[PDB]
Design a protein around this ligand. Structure first.
Ligand SMILES: Cn1ncnc1[C@H]1c2n[nH]c(=O)c3cc(F)cc(c23)N[C@@H]1c1ccc(F)cc1
Length: 336
């Protein structure tokens, strides 16, 4: 019998759900016999990324293009006829990203005591419940409620549980950025099946093999100041309407503000982050400070920037150590 609070136990079961991993694979139409959950390998996936890079290049740039599409399907077996377009190549990339974390999740799970407590320990994260009556819960609730975008109206968000999280070794890694100017509490959403990898390894940057297309500001860690922009990356459906979103303290420092896409390979010297300027910004006057970190929880208003490719802000760091994960929210998506 696990001594852990029931919301923490429910979180572990949700993270380490094999049925969820298998369901995701069934939806991606992967052959579960030719490519079972336990046989997905990093080497196979990284090599598939490379073929998708050799593919997106031919589309950007027919015997050798079919031979590249066919060599990909040989590498990542599917069961269908097998279906140009960088958006389809980016879908395969995202599938491979989900497949990797699905592999990590299964790897931890498979690789005396209650299975819930044993699986908790594999996450190397200290997970505590934030009380509904606390000042932190109130601030977090206000942040969810106010930063829901007017354009994003496919669902309503409801906070189920708020967890305070301490990833093992992240405190040590963060130390150089601890006193940096412009530290902000920002959103990061992901598929529930990715949270085993995120808690055990932290938020990561896409490998060099992975195609850069899709990464507007290049390969880094992306954050939003509007909950609905990050909540979309949960990919919640009416079927599975419960998602997980992070609140991270991000050491932005001096921001390289951009109004359009730019594949950052090296920031301008003296700059520590990119801020993609959006048309709508959370009201800066309502900006509060939760334990010395800026919390942009104001309601969505015009930033004045009409000359931009973005509707809402996004923040990107290019060093994993600039992120200190603080909270994990369990959100109910109530679709309209
Ligand atoms: C899909 N993905 N994989 C890693 N990071 C992400 C996204 C992302 N995840 N989560 C967020 O909360 C977020 C909040 C933003 F304002 C902006 C974001 C994100 N863009 C990231 C993005 C989008 C498309 C793409 F092709 C590559 C990267």
């Amino acid at each position: 019998k696990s001594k852990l609070p029931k919301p923490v136990q429910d979180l572990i079961k949700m993270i380490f759900d094999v049925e969820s991993m298998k369901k995701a694979m069934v939806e991606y139409e992967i052959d579960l016999q030719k490519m079972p959950l336990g046989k997905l390998s990093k080497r196979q996936i990284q090599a598939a990324y490379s073929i998708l890079s050799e593919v997106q290049q031919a589309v950007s740039q027919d015997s050798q293009i079919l031979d590249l599409s066919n060599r990909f399907y040989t590498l990542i077996p599917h069961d269908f006829k097998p279906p140009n377009n960088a958006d389809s190549v980016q879908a395969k990339v995202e599938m491979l990203d989900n497949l990797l974390d699905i592999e990590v999740a299964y790897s931890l799970l498979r690789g005396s005591k209650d299975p819930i407590d044993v699986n908790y320990e594999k996450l190397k994260t200290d997970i505590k419940v934030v009380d509904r009556d606390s000042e932190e819960a109130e601030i977090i609730r206000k942040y969810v409620k106010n930063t829901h975008a007017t354009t994003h109206n496919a669902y309503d968000l409801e906070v189920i549980d708020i967890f305070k999280i301490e990833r093992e070794g992240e405190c040590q890694r963060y130390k150089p950025f601890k006193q940096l100017h412009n530290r902000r509490l920002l959103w990061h959403g992901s598929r529930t099946t990715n949270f085993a990898g995120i808690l055990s390894q932290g938020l990561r940057i896409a490998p060099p093999e992975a195609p850069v297309t899709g990464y507007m500001f290049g390969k880094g860690i992306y954050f939003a100041d509007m909950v609905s922009k990050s909540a979309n990356y949960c990919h919640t459906s009416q079927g599975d309407p419960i998602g997980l979103i992070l609140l991270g303290e991000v050491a932005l420092g001096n921001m390289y503000e951009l109004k359009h896409a730019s594949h950052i390979s090296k920031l301008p010297k003296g700059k520590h982050s990119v801020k993609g300027l959006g048309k709508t910004t959370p009201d800066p006057s309502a900006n509060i400070s939760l334990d010395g970190v800026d919390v942009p929880l104001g309601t969505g208003i015009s930033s004045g920037v009409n000359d931009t490719s973005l509707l809402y802000n996004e923040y990107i760091v290019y060093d994993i150590a600039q992120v200190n994960l603080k909270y994990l929210l369990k959100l109910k998506f109530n679709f309209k």
